[PDB]
Amino acid sequence: STGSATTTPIDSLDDAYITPVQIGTPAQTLNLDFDTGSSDLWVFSSETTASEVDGQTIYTPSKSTTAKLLSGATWSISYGDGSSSSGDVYTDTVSVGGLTVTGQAVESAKKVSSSFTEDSTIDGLLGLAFSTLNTVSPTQQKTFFDNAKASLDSPVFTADLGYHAPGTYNFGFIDTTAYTGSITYTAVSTKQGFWEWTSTGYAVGSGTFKSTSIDGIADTGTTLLYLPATVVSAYWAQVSGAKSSSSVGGYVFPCSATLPSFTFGVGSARIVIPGDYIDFGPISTGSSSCFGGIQSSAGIGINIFGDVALKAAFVVFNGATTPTLGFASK
Numbered sequence: 452s453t454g455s456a457t458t459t460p461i462d463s464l465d466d467a468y469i470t471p472v473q474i475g476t477p478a479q480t481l482n483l484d485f486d487t488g489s490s491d492l493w494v495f496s497s498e499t500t501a502s503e504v505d506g507q508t509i510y511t512p513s514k515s516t517t518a519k520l521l522s523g524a525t526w527s528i529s530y531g532d533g534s535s536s537s538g539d540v541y542t543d544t545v546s547v548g549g550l551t552v553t554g555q556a557v558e559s560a561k562k563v564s565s566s567f568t569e570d571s572t573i574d575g576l577l578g579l580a581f582s583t584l585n586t587v588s589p590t591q592q593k594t595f596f597d598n599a600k601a602s603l604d605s606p607v608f609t610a611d612l613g614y615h616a617p618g619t620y621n622f623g624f625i626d627t628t629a630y631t632g633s634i635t636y637t638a639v640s641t642k643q644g645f646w647e648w649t650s651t652g653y654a655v656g657s658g659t660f661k662s663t664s665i666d667g668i669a670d671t672g673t674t675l676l677y678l679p680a681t682v683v684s685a686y687w688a689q690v691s692g693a694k695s696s697s698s699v700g701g702y703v704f705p706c707s708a709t710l711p712s713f714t715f716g717v718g719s720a721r722i723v724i725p726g727d728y729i730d731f732g733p734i735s736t737g738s739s740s741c742f743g744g745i746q747s748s749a750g751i752g753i754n755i756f757g758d759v760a761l762k763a764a765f766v767v768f769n770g771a772t773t774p775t776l777g778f779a780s781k
C-alpha cells in the first residue's frame with residue numbers, strides 16, 4: 452500500500468505545516484502537524500478543557516463506532532519549545548491520503564499549553580520519530596508510520612515541504628519526479644529516538660565550503676534551522692546590520708536586507724537553502740527588524756535541521772531494518 456497527502460503552511464511565514472488526517476468512523480478530518488521530532492499522535496478533542504480550545508477542530512471519540520478507550524492509558528509530552536499537552540488514549544482507524552491503519556493509538560488531549568490554544572490551525576500532532584519516544588503509559592504505543600510499515604510497498608516516508616506553497620508527504624514510495632539529481636543517503640543513529648544524522652559541513656552564500664561534522668536531527672516539527680554558534684555567527688556576519696538580540700531571543704536583521712543562501716552537506720552532496728527561506732519577517736507587527744531563520748543551538752543540546760533546511764530538499768525517511776535519511780535537491 453501507499454499514502455499521499457498535501458501539506459500546507461499554516462501562515463505566510465511557514466511557521467508550521469498541516470496535513471489532513473481522517474480519524475474514526477465516520478471519518479473526522481483534523482489538520483495535524485506531522486512531526487519527525489516526536490512520536491505521539493495527539494489531537495484536540497471533546498475532552499480538551501473548554502478554555503484551552505480556540506478554533507481547532509476536535510476529535511469526538513463517542514461519535515466514532517471504531518473508537519475504543521485504551522484502559523488505564525495516559526500520555527503527557529513536553530516539547531523543546533516549552534509547549535506541552537496530555538490526556539487519555541483511544542485506538543481508532545487513522546488514514547493519511549489513502550493509507551489506513553486500524554487500531555492506531557490516538558491520544559486525546561485533556562490539557563494543552565497556551566501555544567497550542569493560540570494556534571487555531573493545528574488540530575494536533577502526528578509523531579514520525581522512533582516509537583521509543585512515545586509517552587503512552589503504562590503501555591508504550593507505536594507511531595502511524597511504525598504501524599503502517601509492514602504493509603507499505605517500501606518501508607519509507609518522504610517529506611517535500613513547500614516554500615510559501617503546498618507540499619507533500621508520501622508513505623510507501625519515492626516520487627522520482629519530485630526532485631532533481633539523485634538522492635544521497637546518510638547514516639542515522641536511533642539512540643536518542645530521533646532521525647539523527649551527521650551533516651558534512653556548510654557554506655554561506657557563494658563562500659568556501661567548510662568541511663565539518665554537524666550532528667543533528669531531521670525535524671519537520673521545528674520551524675527553524677538550529678546550528679552551532681560558530682556556524683550561525685559565520686552566516687549572520689554576511690548580513691549588514693544583523694545582530695544577536697537577547698531581548699528578542701536570537702539573531703535579527705534589517706527587513707530591507709536580501710539574505711545570502713546557506714548550503715549544508717549530505718555526504719559529498721550539497722543542499723542549498725535560498726536566502727529568502729531564512730527570512731521570518733518582523734520581530735513584532737510593523738517593526739523594521741526581522742527574525743532570522745538560522746539560530747544557535749547552544750541552549751538546546753542538539754542541532755535541529757527544521758523546516759528551513761528540510762523545505763529546500765526532497766527528504767526520504769528510510770525505515771528499512773537499518774534506518775537511513777536520504778536528501779535530494781528539488
Ligand SMILES: NCc1ccc(C(F)(F)F)cc1
Nearest residue numbers: 530534566567570573672673
Ligand atoms: N515541535 C513540536 C511543536 C509543534 C507545534 C507547536 C505549536 F507552536 F503549535 F505550539 C509547538 C511544538
